Structures are given as C-alpha cells and as structure tokens.
Design a protein around this ligand. Structure first.
Ligand SMILES: Nc1nc2c(ncn2[C@@H]2O[C@H](COP(=O)(O)OP(=O)(O)O)[C@@H](O)[C@H]2O)c(=O)[nH]1
Ligand SMILES: [Mg+2]
Length: 655
C-alpha cells in the first residue's frame, strides 16, 4: 500500500489561461476510472498540490513548493513562453524543483511546438529535450509520437475515449528517428553505460533511457517536454505516464531542513519510523466536517487519534481524523506516513506555516516565525450598514483562517481600515469580500503605514480646565516622554508619588495617553517607540473627574511629541528582482532612483538576482515598471525588513 518509491508529489505551474485548471481536471478524470487532491496512476499515488492563484502570491508559493517534490510546467503552444510563463519557471528554478513540461493547446491555431522548445532553450536556459512530436498541425492534430519508445498513439475522438497505438506514419518517420537519436545522445550524459552504447550505435534499453532521462530531470539538468491538448483529450495519459517515469518521489529530492529551538539546523529524513515532523500549508472550512488543516509529513507517521506538539505555538493539538481528498469524494485514513499529504480534523489553534511534531519527538521548526508587519492600509466605507453587518462578521471570520492582517476603526473618519503586508494581499481580500462573503463598500486606494516618534526627551504637562456640561472640570498631569530603541513599542510608568493625582484617575490618564498616541502631529499616523512617565499633577477636590484626567493625559502626549523633534518612520522592504542578465544595470539604476540600496547581485540560472532595500513608498505599481524595463520578462518579491526614520527632505515632502 504505502511505498515511498511509488509516491509522486506534484503541483502544476502555468501562465494564467495556459491550462493549469483544465489539465488538472483532466488528470483527475483519467485517474478516476476504477488543497491537496489524491489519485492513482499505474500503482503510483499522485498528490496533485494546488499552486497559488497568481504567481505574485509570493508567501503561498514558497510554502506550496516545499510541500511538493516535482512540477509540471505548462506552456501555451500558441504563444510560447509568454513573459509570465518565464516567471513561473523561475519559481521552479528558485525552489530547485525537478520538472517536466507540457506544451498544452496543440489543437488551437498558432500552436507551435518548436516555438516553445526554442524559447525554453534561449530565454529560460532550460535544456528542453523533446520526448514527443505531434501528428498534425491545428484542427488536424490527431496523434502523439513517443520518441523514447518509437511508438505512436492516435486519438479517434476529442473525448478521451479512444486511444490506439499505431506505428509512426512514414511522413514523420525521419523526424522521429532524428529526435530519438538526440534523446539517446542526451541520456548518455547521465549514464556511462549508455555512453559506450551510443558509440557502438547499440540501441540501449528502455530501462536505461528512462532511468537516465529521469536522473537528469531530478538532478535539475534537463527538462523533458511533452505536448497535447487537455481540452480535446490527447496527451494527458502520456503526460500522466511522464509523471510516473520522470518526476521525483520523496526519496529523490534532498531532505528538507529544520531549525531546533537553539537556532541550529537539522536535515530531516523521510524515515517513516523515525520522529514525526509535519508542515501545515493550508486551512480550509469544509461544510461536511468543519475546518481542515492540510499537512505534509516529512518524517515518522501521523496517526489518527493522537496528540502532536505544535512547535511554532507552544500547545498540543488533538488529531481527530485524518483525510484524503479525492476528485469526487473524501476518505478517512488511520495514518499519513513520511512522504505523504492529507488533511487533519481537530486542531483548533493551528494555522498555516506551523510545525506539527511527535509530541515526545524532537522540537524543530520548518519556517520563519516573525510576522510581516501591517505595512499597507485600505479604507472601506460600508454601504448603508446593511453591508457593514455582514462585512464585520466576514472580516472577523476572515481572521479565523488568516492572522497575518489587522482590522481597525479609524480614530477620525469612522471608516473601517484593513491593514496587510502588501497590496496584492489586500487586493485578494477585497476579492473574497464582494464575492465569497458578499459585501459592498467604497474601497480606498492602498497606502503605506507610516509611524511617528520623538528623537529627544521632553518634559511637558497637560491641563484641562473647563465649565462645560453644567459642572466644573479639572485635570492636570505632568509627563516625561523619552524615545525608546527602534521596534521597542510602548512603555508606561506611573511614578505619581502620594495622591498628587488621586488613584481613581490614573486609569483615565492612561486611556488619554493611549487614545492620543493614535495620531502623531506630523501626518496623523500612530506614535510609536516611546516611554511615558507620569510624575506629577494636581487635582481640585470636587471639580476633578475621569473625563478631565483623560483629556489631560491626551493633551500632554500631543505636546510631548511636538516638542520632541518628531520624525516620521517609514517601512523599508527587502527586494529581490529576477531579471535576464541584459537588463541588470538598466534595472539597478531604476532601483537606485527609488532611494534603493543594492546589496549585491548574484545570478540564478541564466537570469540574475538583485537584492535591495527599497522603501515601500517608492514601490506602488512596481510590476508595471519592471515589465517596461525587462521587455516583460522580469519579476520581484518583497518582504518587510525594518522601519527607518525618513530622511530630511522626505519628511518635508510628506508634510
Ligand atoms: N484550444 C484549447 N484550449 C484550451 C486547452 N486547454 C485549456 N484551454 C482553455 O483554457 C481555458 C481555461 O484555462 P485554465 O485551465 O483555467 O488555465 P489557467 O488560467 O492557467 O488555470 C478554457 O476556456 C479552455 O478553453 C487546449 O488544450 N486547447
Ligand atoms: Mg484556474
């Protein structure tokens, strides 16, 4: 039943509209006749892993690529590797994932196989090796020639229900012999035994070839290529074969790496008997069973009805059931062994990124712990409260699956404000808002979340003394406000000596300080990184109140941040641009005019990779500035890094 060798853990990467969904639907179908979906082909368990909706989704991508072992990259035979198709490739390259390739849509007009092969060779530097030729051109496209084995299959309809092996037609007999030769010439690069047979012109054996091509695929040197039309059902069974021949099992890729509690790195082996280590990569809210938290298992066995320690978060979780999702049904299983993926039921306080271990087995983490700061805000004016009522429920329901964002109510516009770690993040949340959770609102343009703070210690005071509301009000506080090292946040001390301020009012003061740190004086963004010591004041015996000392506190914070040489803090993003070698300096220059700070350029593949420190505020609509400077071919990722005082002229320009 469970045999690692015969496990094939895959995802499908493709341009948008290239054919990922159709190809996936079609695979499921063919493996039918008897977040992570499971099926069987020729005694192999193929766990198709769902790869992000768009490639820019950078956090999900990284995580969904160490959850898979090998990938199928799908190109539109009409257009070639369309500049975003280069970008999905760079992904696989980046995460060192063994891959095959699939020239989809060989049935449409414009479908050129050779365009794909060439563009793969030239642009991506991929080393395609042709493993089949198409019999036919457009609508004429009817057959597919396996040049490894020198056979040919023909398709008697566009339904998937008539595949007959035929000899290669003599019209394609030259071309096939030609490409078989190329294949055997390649295979010999990875098998010495095949080298001494290619000399002799002694046709080596299918075992040898397949093994050789495979070794090459898995060690990231070659990229076999197959074609077909997933829509008109041709080539999807051979593509499925390909998965089982050339794509890696968990035994084939190097073991994932994990961090002990002492910052140390451990290599983590697929030994199904050894300790347990799982990584959770998606949470979903299934109707018939509640919340499913999908995991991938690296070592040991995860047994249904058992307890696992969540090393990311400190608690234990109850593994109630274990599931496998199939195309058309679910399946309860007793265990998921090392090399496998499923869903688990139970697990109240487990979220994605988190690491599940064997309870009394070594505590290791598998990702980074730090939380991306909420660096981009968006305002939404809800409809007529009839939407707010289902908005608010949804937004708080959004945070049952996602803790990487914050919800606030703006101190002085009334609006509801979402905060995230980038724009796309928010763009997809709004997507889930007006559709999935059905909500409507006047959405605002995304903006950078700045922060204020003071650069020098001050010693101010606050007085509120009025005859409002019928009675007499009075509250007097004196504070010392001093700057706190970056990222330290807030600190309050009470140092009031002896009823100088009546104990009842100290809370009211604090509230006042708190409610007024929410709007700095430079641009009305939250004050941060300061220490507030309440050290004096006065009351008037009947006139004082809570309202009074609230405002007094508030009025002294507004003073302390005006006198303290206030400065604005901006978020500084860590940027990695992937560009073809040619645009290097023409791209570096553009980063350098964004107040960037180049940290060094090493090459990845044939492309090059620049590292920088560009501030978030010099980045809005960056992707269209890359596609203008890289002939469409470049791309970039972006992560928070640190807040930095704005430079003099940017302070002035932001006021
Ligand atoms: N002509 C043709 N069209 C295809 C083929 N495969 C997919 N499509 C088209 O692609 C569209 C859906 O694309 P999809 O599979 O979702 O690609 P994705 O955007 O990468 O997920 C459908 O409208 C299909 O008409 C094919 O083999 N031939
Ligand atoms: Mg799709």
């Amino acid at each position: 039943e469970y045999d690692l060798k015969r496990l094939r853990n895959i995802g499908i990467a493709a341009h948008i509209d290239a054919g990922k969904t159709t190809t996936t639907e079609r695979i499921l179908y063919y493996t039918g006749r008897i977040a992570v979906t499971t099926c069987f082909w020729k005694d192999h368990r193929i766990n198709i892993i769902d790869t992000p909706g768009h490639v820019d989704f950078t956090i999900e991508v990284e995580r969904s690529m160490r959850v898979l072992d090998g990938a199928i990259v799908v190109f539109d035979s009409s257009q070639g590797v369309e500049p975003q198709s280069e970008t999905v490739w760079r992904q696989a390259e980046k995460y060192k994932v063994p891959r095959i390739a699939f020239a989809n849509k060989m049935d449409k007009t414009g479908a050129d196989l050779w365009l794909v092969i060439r563009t793969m060779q030239e642009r991506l530097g991929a080393r395609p090796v042709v493993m089949q030729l198409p019999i036919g051109r457009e609508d004429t496209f009817s057959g597919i020639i396996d040049v490894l084995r020198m056979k040919a299959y023909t398709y008697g309809n566009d339904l998937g229900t008539d595949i007959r092996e035929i000899p290669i037609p003599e019209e394609y007999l030259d071309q096939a012999r030609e490409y078989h030769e190329k294949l055997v010439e390649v295979a010999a690069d990875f098998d010495e035994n095949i080298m001494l047979k290619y000399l002799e012109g002694e046709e080596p054996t299918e075992e040898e070839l397949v093994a050789a091509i495979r070794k090459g695929t898995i060690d990231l040197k070659i990229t076999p290529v197959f074609l077909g039309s997933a829509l008109k059902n041709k080539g999807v069974q051979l593509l499925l074969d390909a998965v089982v021949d050339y794509l890696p099992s968990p035994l084939d890729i190097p073991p994932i790496k994990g961090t002990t509690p002492e910052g140390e790195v451990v290599e983590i082996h697929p030994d199904p008997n050894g300790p347990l280590a799982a990584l959770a990569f998606k949470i979903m809210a299934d109707p018939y069973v509640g919340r499913l938290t999908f995991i991938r298992v690296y070592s040991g066995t995860l047994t249904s009805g058992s307890y696992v320690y969540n090393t990311t978060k400190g608690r234990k979780e109850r593994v109630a059931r274990l599931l496998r999702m199939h195309a058309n049904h679910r399946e309860e299983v007793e265990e998921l062994k090392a090399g496998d993926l499923g869903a688990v039921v139970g697990l109240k306080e487990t979220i994605t990124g988190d690491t599940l271990v064997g309870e009394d087995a070594p505590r290791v983490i598998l990702e980074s712990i730090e939380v991306p700061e909420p660096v981009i805000d968006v305002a939404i004016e809800p409809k007529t409260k009839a939407d707010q009522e289902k908005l608010s429920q949804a937004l708080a329901r959004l945070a049952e699956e996602d803790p990487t964002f914050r919800v606030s109510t703006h101190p002085e516009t009334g609006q509801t404000i979402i905060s995230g770690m980038g724009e796309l993040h928010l763009e997809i949340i709004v997507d889930r808002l007006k559709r999935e959770f059905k909500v409507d609102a006047n959405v605002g343009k995304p903006q950078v979340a700045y922060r204020e703070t003071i650069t020098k210690p001050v010693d101010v005071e606050g007085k509120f003394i009025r005859q409002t509301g019928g009675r007499g009000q009075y509250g007097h506080v004196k504070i010392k406000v001093e700057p706190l090292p970056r990222g330290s946040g807030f600190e309050f001390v009470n140092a009031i000596v002896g009823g100088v301020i009546p104990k009842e009012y100290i809370p009211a003061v604090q509230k006042g300080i708190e409610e007024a740190m929410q709007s700095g004086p430079l641009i009305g963004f939250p004050v941060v990184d300061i220490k507030v010591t309440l050290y004096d004041g006065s009351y008037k015996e009947v006139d004082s109140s809570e309202m009074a000392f609230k405002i007094a506190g508030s009025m002294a914070i507004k003073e302390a941040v005006q006198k303290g040489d206030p400065v604005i803090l901006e978020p500084i993003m860590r940027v990695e641009v992937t560009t073809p070698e040619e645009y290097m300096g023409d791209v570096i220059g553009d980063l350098n005019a964004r107040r960037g700070q180049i940290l060094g350029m090493e090459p990845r593949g044939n492309a090059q990779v620049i590292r920088a420190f560009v501030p978030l505020a010099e980045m809005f609509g960056y992707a269209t500035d890359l596609r203008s400077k890289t002939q469409g071919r470049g791309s970039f990722v972006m992560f928070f890094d640190h807040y930095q005082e704005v430079p003099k002229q940017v302070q002035e320009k932001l006021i």
